[PDB]
Nucleic acid binder design. Structure first.
Ligand SMILES: [Cl-]
Ligand SMILES: [Cl-]
Ligand SMILES: [Zn+2]
Ligand SMILES: [Zn+2]
Ligand SMILES: [Zn+2]
Ligand SMILES: [Zn+2]
Lengths: 345, 129, 129, 345, 129, 129, 128, 124, 128, 124
RNA sequence: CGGUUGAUCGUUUUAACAA
RNA sequence: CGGUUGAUCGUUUUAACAA
């Protein structure tokens, strides 16, 4: 049925806290659009919401509904899902094999929470689902408002967001970006990491100490951007790794601009509270008291060089078999920035 | 008869502006739709439906075995790539004939109507008004 | 030609209208007996494998029969999934298919001279307009 | 929901023809009773009807409903099912493992049709379900009337049975008795097969010719009773075996009383129409022109002796490790009956 | 003793009555604004992990709060599956639990001096009588 | 106070004829029900409910951490095989105390009530009538 | 007693694979009509109680018979009830067993939407 | 042919009967089924899903000498069966011990045949 | 590079068996309180990326550690992602592997509604 | 002990990697993983579900010499690992050819040990 | 298993029960 | 696959849509 669920179930189930224990049911709100004369028109009757059963997840019921619909196969369809938990292995595999057999339908999925984001089995299932042609995103405030207005029997009552919605959304976006292994295309890399821009993109890697030797972590590698600036999002993503308090970890950051005042203060406080995490920041530009305070807190502020650029191109760039090509005025600008930073610090 | 056919709204609506199309298995690819349509036209053991594009009206060609109580044809060999349809019937008490054709490739074509107890129904219609 | 066919004009309707029509007919047939002379034939009394129901309405010395179907081909619109209706008038092995307008006029001439069951609301296409 | 299904779906789905092709959905009407003060009281709210899904059979949904009910475990419950198709292997196994873990609930099942009664996999699944403690029966006219009155939104309309309901019910009862491998307890055998009684019980076996040698068929062995007499039920069960028209089959019958006039005429007509089936009737009593006509049609009417009694006791009697014990006045009565039959025929 | 407890009288009710109460309150709160000064607090504003809703009703200088719960222990009857209600009256950190009779009397004294939302119909036990 | 407790219908109903029982996990066998009840009584981190046999009234002992704003005891060592319950509270504006006990084997026992702004609620009750 | 027996090579498979086989075979001889020359024999047309169904593929003067089996006391997950498939080239009272590869090559020589292939039906992933 | 030697190396055979039941009755049932016949006997290869089936001759519609014998040596049973495979008349022989329903088995070889050989060469 | 490695014996099992194990273990140390002396360590408390969870059973002066694993590139139905179980008797820096039978006998010696048994978790029906 | 000889007879080992992928890259990945390390290598017995796992030492929280070597002979790799099992210090050694990721492997043996032996005898 | 939730697939799973 | 149905798990799968 189209949009007749009570607000209390919505608020209880679509809470976006990354670790939420007593939500054993999955809710799926689905809508369908059709391509006509080059524009996507809403299909008003082909929308609704379903919930799970003891051994019957909402994806299976949606597949049964699609089978009963008997959509014209000579048309193009876009389906949008809003789901509380990310699909499990069985549901992800069956959705992938459904998408592979029906090329006239595309699927976009918004998730409130990630289900077992620390389990490589579900990570591989989600990666396969994304490779099959599905778009997986994190449900933000706009989507919550849309679901409240469209699928909730609110009777005109205003939507009251829960505490910490934005921080949870940013943390979940960071984890999803880690899981899906996103990469920057060469144009964005060239436009953003040039030393000569209203956005700040930062990459990050993690290493662990073992017998006076640093060993890289395969999963703890990635990058993110701004939606608050990107440093706050990274510091919000950090606590969900559960870094051990007995071993030594080093976090290497590759940031375009220098951190702001509030971001630098937050980073300094975080690295002062956690003595087991060393920080190595290698920036490319400068956006100086905050930088000096951050450096004196324990961080190692440096300037990117050719080796760092080559590592970034090999690591976080979707070059697709293309070697790195440096741009004009790289070495002189890098040397000038390094000298200026050495004189300042 | 002739005056009733040329004067009543229903017959004019079905005779003036009508184009037909075949939508048998709309969720299936074109090739097996063509194959199923050809098979159904050839065996004579399954229904075939032709829907008017504008309205919800449809013509169903049921097999005669399904009637049980009792000129029309669905033929192929008149022209390669086309199916021709003739169906006599009694509509609103008058004898009318439906004539059409659809191509096997597009599963589309044209279809229109023509002209070609009986007194008890006329009496009932007069008393109906 | 060894293939013999039967021709029927079937008005394609959705499932909700079929359910409403059946519920109203059975409610006005047993609870509020304004239409008590009607014969609501159940599912399986027919040679045609796909004929879900059959309502007989005695009009004087003849009868108007409304038969609904399930299991037809899909329609052009989204909610024409294979159900339809057909109304005709018969008198001792003479049958003629009847416009729903004329069918409701006949029904109200003899019987009616919860909403009353009408075939114009059942057969009207709410998805093409 | 309690009893709100339209009559047309009921009539279409609960048709009891043994071979019915285009019914791809399963309907399950369930009701529950509770034991209070030694009497079984109806639980008015714990009843309803469900249907199947693409990969979700009604048994699974009923199990989920039972889980949600949270019945008191210190009570006794009886559940009644009315189902269109007999349960498949997965559903039968899971119902058996549910019954084995919950000993405070008993289950009685009425089936409109048997699903793949010729498939030994489903036969074994049904036998396991019956061994687990479930009662499996064939839905007769009284149960159809009860379901029409209770679970069907008939609005007071009378129930109109379809053609051939009773014959189909008897044939399905015979097939279910063959599948479940029922047996007579010693008291019934002694009371009915004594030669010195308002019921006629008959046993039957089948053999096939192969190189001038009779080979027994393991599945085609059983017995039945009266509900029309039992011979008509047996002749109705016969056509569903699909006996081949090229090989030679012999049907051996062990009947208590002699066949009636109409039953003898029907049997003679059936054995005259089918020349590939020989009939060997070995009766125990006499209920004579019909018998003479049946014998002249091709049958071999005989009288049971000690060997036949021993075979019956070993074959169709639940003796449970107990040898056969003949009763008084057996040999003299058997010899007198044999002499009388020889004089008559 | 290191265990400290809180005591609440919770009226065990079924799910249908909870849904009806919530629907009536929200319908008389926004559509027909006879009760517009009420504050319908949503699910998660509480320290208690199991408190599905909380309706505040200002009575002069104090407030009558009705809180419903989900996730409680099962009841004695068949349909007491873990949901309940509790009504109390508070004024500046002074609270007293209120009989539903007295609660409805207070509600009708101040506000009412689709059916009107009453707590006597919500809390009444229709399964024990 | 004393006169109100001895004269009003609600207090007499909860004080005169009341017996309590524990129904925590009614679908689980007796042994694990006893184990869960003992564990819940000992840890002080989970609720315990006691339902009046006749009506739908129940007493819930929530942990103090779930309150968040602020004598009672649930104790074991007074007698082996029994749990004793004391719960002070404010009901209908007057201070009342609930006293009871249940055995660990039958998960059943006895429970009854006793006697042991304030003026603003009295004024509201007088104006309520 | 043990003086007469019959020997065949039977490949244990899953029930869903048998259903897929008997669905594509019916589809290809009824709807698509690419294999309308094939023959299908049901369970009641054979004397062997363990024969599920038989599919006859004409190859001119000879035929290829592929038979399915229930009732095998082998089982897949040790359920004492397992399915099986057998292949037999038959030419006027002459008979032999054929491995799936040669049978598929025979089918492709004379014949030819998924297609009914014997390798997909007979191959195993439970032990490989 | 590669198929023969592919399914003739280090191949041991083992009985599959009432697997979900205890072993003692399993050998008892194997014993009495091998004695009387009127039943199907399975012998699966360990490596793959290939299986030898022993069907009574009465199950066939029509009609070559092959045997299963256990009385020549106590505690072990010998199996012999010729069968035409891919146009050649190979003969499969083996044995399994009666105590553990396990043993060894191998296939060694002895107008329509040439017709199939021609057809097979044509199917390349 | 290849100068340092670690060797353990890991038994491939199914995910549902792992879930059953970690459900009965939690039940028996939380509700029934028969095994309240056992310890449970989650995934984030171990350095090995492939360790799922660890269960510690005290046996007096020594302990029995049973560890679960995801991420194995073996797979059950060849999905390159399989679970596994490992057993280790540990006594004050001394460690050894223990087969399931001896571990179950150790548990029954010191300890003891279904019970958490290692044979039911480690045994196989896919190859037996 | 019966366990050792039960899992030491006719036991051949075979590599399990990216099984759902072609063989050429499978041996390439086995090659480079054996070269660099930083990965887990599995060797399962054919008969049962027993498996030898090769974990990098950095994955352990703390801390015995054992190796996997392929440069002594081209096209084949040799495996050596000591490990204490049931109180005895058995050593598992084997080899697999690099072309087919198959080969042979066997385990031959070399205060807390006596303590475990006493506990094991007590657990009878 | 009220845990700064590592997440058992809890009527915490349901459109109308007071229209 | 309208077959004297050997049975694809067909809106032939649905309580209110005209209360
Ligand atoms: Cl899911
Ligand atoms: Cl079922
Ligand atoms: Zn799922
Ligand atoms: Zn900032
Ligand atoms: Zn089923
Ligand atoms: Zn009779």
């Amino acid at each position: 049925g189209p949009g007749h669920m009570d607000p209390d179930t919505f608020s209880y189930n679509f809470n976006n806290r990354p670790i939420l224990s007593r939500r054993n049911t999955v809710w799926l709100c689905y809508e369908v659009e059709r391509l006509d004369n080059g524009t996507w028109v809403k299909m008003d009757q082909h929308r609704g919401q379903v919930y799970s059963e003891l051994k019957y997840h909402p994806e299976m019921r949606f597949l049964s509904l699609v089978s009963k619909w008997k959509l014209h196969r000579d048309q193009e369809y876009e389906v949008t899902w809003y789901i509380s938990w990310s699909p499990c292995t069985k549901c992800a595999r069956d959705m992938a094999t459904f998408l592979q057999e029906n090329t006239h339908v595309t699927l976009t999925i918004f998730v409130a929470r990630l289900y077992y984001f620390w389990d490589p089995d579900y990570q591989e299932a989600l990666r396969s689902l994304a490779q099959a042609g599905a778009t997986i995103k994190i449900m933000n405030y706009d989507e919550f408002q849309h679901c409240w207005s469209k699928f909730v029997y609110s009777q005109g009552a205003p939507f009251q967001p829960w505490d910490g919605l934005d921080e949870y959304s940013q943390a979940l976006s960071g984890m999803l970006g880690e899981i899906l292994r996103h990469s920057m295309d060469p144009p964005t890399f060239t436009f953003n990491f040039n030393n000569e821009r209203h956005e700040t993109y930062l990459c990050y890697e993690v290493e662990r100490m073992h017998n006076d030797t640093w060993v890289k972590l395969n999963q703890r590698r990635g990058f993110l951007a701004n939606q608050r600036h990107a440093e706050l999002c990274f510091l919000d993503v950090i606590p969900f790794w559960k870094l051990d308090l007995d071993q030594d970890y080093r976090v290497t950051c590759f940031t375009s601009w220098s951190p702001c005042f509030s971001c630098a203060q937050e980073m300094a406080k975080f690295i002062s509270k956690n003595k087991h995490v060393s920080l190595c920041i290698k920036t490319a530009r400068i956006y100086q008291e905050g930088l000096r305070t951050l450096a004196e807190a324990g961080a190692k502020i440096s300037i990117m060089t050719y080796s760092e650029f080559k590592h970034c191109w090999d690591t976080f760039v979707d070059h697709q078999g293309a070697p790195f090509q440096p741009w004009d005025g790289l070495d002189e600008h890098s040397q000038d920035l390094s000298g200026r930073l050495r004189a300042i610090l | 008869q002739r005056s009733k056919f040329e004067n009543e709204e229903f017959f004019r609506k079905l005779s003036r502006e009508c184009e037909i199309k075949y939508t048998g298995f709309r969720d299936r690819p074109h090739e097996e739709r063509q194959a199923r349509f050809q098979n159904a036209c050839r065996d004579g053991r399954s229904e075939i439906a032709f829907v008017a594009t504008g309205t919800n009206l449809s013509l169903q060609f049921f097999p005669a075995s399904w009637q049980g109580e009792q000129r029309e044809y669905v033929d192929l060999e008149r022209e390669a790539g086309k199916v021709y349809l003739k169906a006599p019937m009694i509509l609103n008490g008058v004898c009318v004939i439906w004539k059409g054709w659809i191509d096997l490739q597009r599963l589309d074509g044209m279809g229109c109507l023509e002209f070609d107890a009986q007194q008890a129904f006329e009496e009932a219609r007069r008393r109906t008004r | 030609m060894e293939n013999r066919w039967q021709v029927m004009i079937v008005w394609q309707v959705d499932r909700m209208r079929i359910n409403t029509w059946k519920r109203l007919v059975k409610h006005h047939m047993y609870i509020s007996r304004k239409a008590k002379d009607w014969f609501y034939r159940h599912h399986y009394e027919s040679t045609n494998p796909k004929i879900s129901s059959e309502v007989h309405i005695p009009l004087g010395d003849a009868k108007l029969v409304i038969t609904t179907y399930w299991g037809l081909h899909t329609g052009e619109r989204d909610w024409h999934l294979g159900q339809g209706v057909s109304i005709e008038w018969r008198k001792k092995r003479y049958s003629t298919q009847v416009d729903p307008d004329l069918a409701d006029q006949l029904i109200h001439l003899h019987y009616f001279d919860p909403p009353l069951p009408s075939v114009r609301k059942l057969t009207e296409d709410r998805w093409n307009k």
